[PDB]
PDB file of C-alpha atoms and ligand atoms in Angstrom:
ATOM      1  CA  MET U   1      97.850 120.306 106.513  1.00 40.28           C
ATOM      2  CA  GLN U   2      98.514 123.159 104.383  1.00 41.32           C
ATOM      3  CA  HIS U   3      99.714 125.793 106.881  1.00 42.53           C
ATOM      4  CA  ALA U   4      99.929 124.315 109.790  1.00 42.20           C
ATOM      5  CA  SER U   5     101.003 126.316 112.372  1.00 44.33           C
ATOM      6  CA  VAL U   6      98.186 128.912 111.340  1.00 43.62           C
ATOM      7  CA  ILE U   7      95.805 126.218 112.528  1.00 45.91           C
ATOM      8  CA  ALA U   8      97.607 126.444 115.820  1.00 45.01           C
ATOM      9  CA  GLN U   9      98.460 129.761 116.004  1.00 41.62           C
ATOM     10  CA  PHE U  10      94.808 130.521 115.061  1.00 42.22           C
ATOM     11  CA  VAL U  11      93.058 128.494 118.125  1.00 42.48           C
ATOM     12  CA  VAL U  12      96.055 129.762 120.317  1.00 44.59           C
ATOM     13  CA  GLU U  13      96.597 133.073 119.716  1.00 48.63           C
ATOM     14  CA  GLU U  14      92.795 133.597 120.001  1.00 46.47           C
ATOM     15  CA  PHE U  15      93.550 132.195 124.143  1.00 45.75           C
ATOM     16  CA  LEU U  16      96.745 132.638 124.808  1.00 46.73           C
ATOM     17  CA  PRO U  17      98.787 135.645 122.099  1.00 45.77           C
ATOM     18  CA  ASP U  18     101.041 136.836 124.962  1.00 44.43           C
ATOM     19  CA  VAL U  19     102.993 133.388 124.386  1.00 43.99           C
ATOM     20  CA  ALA U  20     104.621 132.069 121.447  1.00 46.23           C
ATOM     21  CA  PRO U  21     102.299 130.235 119.475  1.00 45.77           C
ATOM     22  CA  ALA U  22     104.367 128.547 117.570  1.00 48.43           C
ATOM     23  CA  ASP U  23     106.308 127.534 120.784  1.00 48.30           C
ATOM     24  CA  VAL U  24     102.925 125.944 122.615  1.00 52.04           C
ATOM     25  CA  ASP U  25     102.241 122.229 122.302  1.00 50.69           C
ATOM     26  CA  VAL U  26      99.753 121.915 119.310  1.00 51.24           C
ATOM     27  CA  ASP U  27      99.552 118.671 120.179  1.00 50.83           C
ATOM     28  CA  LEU U  28      96.835 119.974 122.930  1.00 51.45           C
ATOM     29  CA  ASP U  29      93.276 118.831 122.883  1.00 50.67           C
ATOM     30  CA  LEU U  30      91.095 122.122 122.927  1.00 49.55           C
ATOM     31  CA  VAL U  31      89.227 120.515 125.158  1.00 49.47           C
ATOM     32  CA  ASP U  32      90.464 122.424 127.549  1.00 49.75           C
ATOM     33  CA  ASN U  33      90.062 125.301 125.756  1.00 52.31           C
ATOM     34  CA  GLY U  34      86.598 123.469 125.200  1.00 49.96           C
ATOM     35  CA  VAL U  35      84.891 127.559 126.621  1.00 50.06           C
ATOM     36  CA  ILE U  36      85.401 128.199 122.030  1.00 51.46           C
ATOM     37  CA  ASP U  37      83.056 125.062 121.710  1.00 50.32           C
ATOM     38  CA  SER U  38      79.996 126.962 122.752  1.00 53.71           C
ATOM     39  CA  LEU U  39      79.994 130.556 123.605  1.00 57.15           C
ATOM     40  CA  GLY U  40      83.511 131.125 120.423  1.00 57.17           C
ATOM     41  CA  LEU U  41      81.775 128.864 118.055  1.00 60.36           C
ATOM     42  CA  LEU U  42      78.611 130.569 117.565  1.00 59.31           C
ATOM     43  CA  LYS U  43      80.801 133.638 117.165  1.00 60.68           C
ATOM     44  CA  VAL U  44      83.175 131.607 114.984  1.00 62.56           C
ATOM     45  CA  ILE U  45      80.341 129.614 113.213  1.00 61.77           C
ATOM     46  CA  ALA U  46      78.640 133.022 112.077  1.00 65.23           C
ATOM     47  CA  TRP U  47      81.679 134.945 111.090  1.00 64.43           C
ATOM     48  CA  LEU U  48      83.666 132.336 109.498  1.00 66.44           C
ATOM     49  CA  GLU U  49      80.357 131.185 107.904  1.00 65.48           C
ATOM     50  CA  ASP U  50      80.089 134.171 107.090  1.00 67.90           C
ATOM     51  CA  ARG U  51      83.651 135.304 105.799  1.00 66.08           C
ATOM     52  CA  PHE U  52      83.697 132.124 103.430  1.00 67.11           C
ATOM     53  CA  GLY U  53      80.230 131.120 103.032  1.00 66.12           C
ATOM     54  CA  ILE U  54      79.969 127.932 104.244  1.00 69.87           C
ATOM     55  CA  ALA U  55      77.302 126.372 105.512  1.00 71.45           C
ATOM     56  CA  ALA U  56      76.793 124.819 108.738  1.00 73.31           C
ATOM     57  CA  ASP U  57      74.926 122.206 107.631  1.00 73.02           C
ATOM     58  CA  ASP U  58      78.413 121.213 105.600  1.00 72.12           C
ATOM     59  CA  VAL U  59      79.569 119.677 109.072  1.00 70.09           C
ATOM     60  CA  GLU U  60      78.479 119.356 112.558  1.00 73.40           C
ATOM     61  CA  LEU U  61      79.209 120.794 115.478  1.00 73.46           C
ATOM     62  CA  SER U  62      80.590 118.884 118.499  1.00 71.23           C
ATOM     63  CA  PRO U  63      83.336 118.640 120.891  1.00 74.26           C
ATOM     64  CA  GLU U  64      84.516 115.496 119.518  1.00 75.52           C
ATOM     65  CA  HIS U  65      85.715 117.974 116.663  1.00 77.27           C
ATOM     66  CA  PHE U  66      87.930 120.568 118.798  1.00 73.29           C
ATOM     67  CA  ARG U  67      89.332 117.163 120.385  1.00 75.61           C
ATOM     68  CA  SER U  68      92.333 117.822 118.951  1.00 76.14           C
ATOM     69  CA  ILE U  69      94.238 120.444 117.051  1.00 74.74           C
ATOM     70  CA  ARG U  70      94.880 117.895 113.870  1.00 72.65           C
ATOM     71  CA  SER U  71      91.904 116.738 113.396  1.00 75.34           C
ATOM     72  CA  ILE U  72      89.474 119.924 112.757  1.00 77.15           C
ATOM     73  CA  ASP U  73      92.643 120.209 110.618  1.00 79.29           C
ATOM     74  CA  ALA U  74      91.710 117.664 108.487  1.00 83.01           C
ATOM     75  CA  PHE U  75      87.991 119.010 108.218  1.00 85.20           C
ATOM     76  CA  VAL U  76      88.935 122.485 107.169  1.00 79.44           C
ATOM     77  CA  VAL U  77      91.924 121.139 104.739  1.00 79.19           C
ATOM     78  CA  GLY U  78      88.874 118.745 103.447  1.00 78.12           C
ATOM     79  CA  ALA U  79      86.824 121.750 102.671  1.00 77.12           C
ATOM     80  CA  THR U  80      89.165 124.782 102.388  1.00 75.24           C
ATOM     81  CA  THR U  81      92.732 126.054 104.093  1.00 71.49           C
ATOM     82  CA  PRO U  82      92.174 129.838 104.647  1.00 72.69           C
ATOM     83  CA  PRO U  83      96.065 130.935 105.568  1.00 69.00           C
ATOM     84  CA  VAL U  84      96.524 134.102 107.387  1.00 69.17           C
ATOM     85  CA  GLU U  85      98.426 136.459 109.146  1.00 72.25           C
ATOM     86  CA  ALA U  86      95.825 137.094 112.860  1.00 69.08           C
ATOM     87  CA  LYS U  87      93.371 135.998 113.532  1.00 66.72           C
ATOM     88  CA  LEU U  88      90.793 138.625 112.965  1.00 66.75           C
ATOM     89  CA  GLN U  89      88.303 139.082 115.770  1.00 63.49           C
TER      90      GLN U  89
HETATM   91  P1  PN7 R   1      80.095 124.466 125.728  1.00 61.44           P
HETATM   92  O1  PN7 R   1      81.152 124.273 125.925  1.00 61.44           O
HETATM   93  O2  PN7 R   1      78.620 124.647 126.099  1.00 61.44           O
HETATM   94  O3  PN7 R   1      80.367 123.963 124.304  1.00 61.44           O
HETATM   95  C1  PN7 R   1      80.115 122.202 124.872  1.00 61.44           C
HETATM   96  C2  PN7 R   1      79.534 121.534 123.232  1.00 61.44           C
HETATM   97  C3  PN7 R   1      80.832 121.734 122.028  1.00 61.44           C
HETATM   98  C4  PN7 R   1      79.636 119.882 123.954  1.00 61.44           C
HETATM   99  C5  PN7 R   1      78.323 122.384 122.908  1.00 61.44           C
HETATM  100  O4  PN7 R   1      77.342 121.910 123.734  1.00 61.44           O
HETATM  101  C6  PN7 R   1      77.673 121.118 121.915  1.00 61.44           C
HETATM  102  O5  PN7 R   1      76.663 120.215 122.069  1.00 61.44           O
HETATM  103  N1  PN7 R   1      78.764 121.637 120.781  1.00 61.44           N
HETATM  104  C7  PN7 R   1      78.649 122.504 120.168  1.00 61.44           C
HETATM  105  C8  PN7 R   1      77.121 123.105 119.877  1.00 61.44           C
HETATM  106  C9  PN7 R   1      77.190 124.398 119.964  1.00 61.44           C
HETATM  107  O6  PN7 R   1      76.030 124.810 118.882  1.00 61.44           O
HETATM  108  N2  PN7 R   1      77.054 125.999 120.251  1.00 61.44           N
HETATM  109  C10 PN7 R   1      77.147 127.453 120.218  1.00 61.44           C
HETATM  110  C11 PN7 R   1      76.245 127.297 120.519  1.00 61.44           C
HETATM  111  S1  PN7 R   1      76.231 126.934 122.706  1.00 61.44           S
END
């Protein structure tokens, strides 16, 4: 897990940026925020894939992928771990 704090900040900042993301239990299943799994996922995959040019086929989309931030961290780290100071819309 590299820059794991950025991953929580990346997802948490999108939902609650007025709250310190490092002060949020990053152990919460993003499923509650599943709102991003469909509407945000379409925008994130289209924008995120374009930014790194990663084909969606490389990874399958499913609710289990958002079950926990740690699970996603492994898939992202296994392919690419891009650290960012803040989430870009
Ligand atoms: P949302 O809560 O409608 O997304 C829920 C899940 C993740 C179950 C979604 O239906 C799914 O099967 N996975 C992602 C599908 C997808 O490509 N989303 C973009 C347009 S819905």
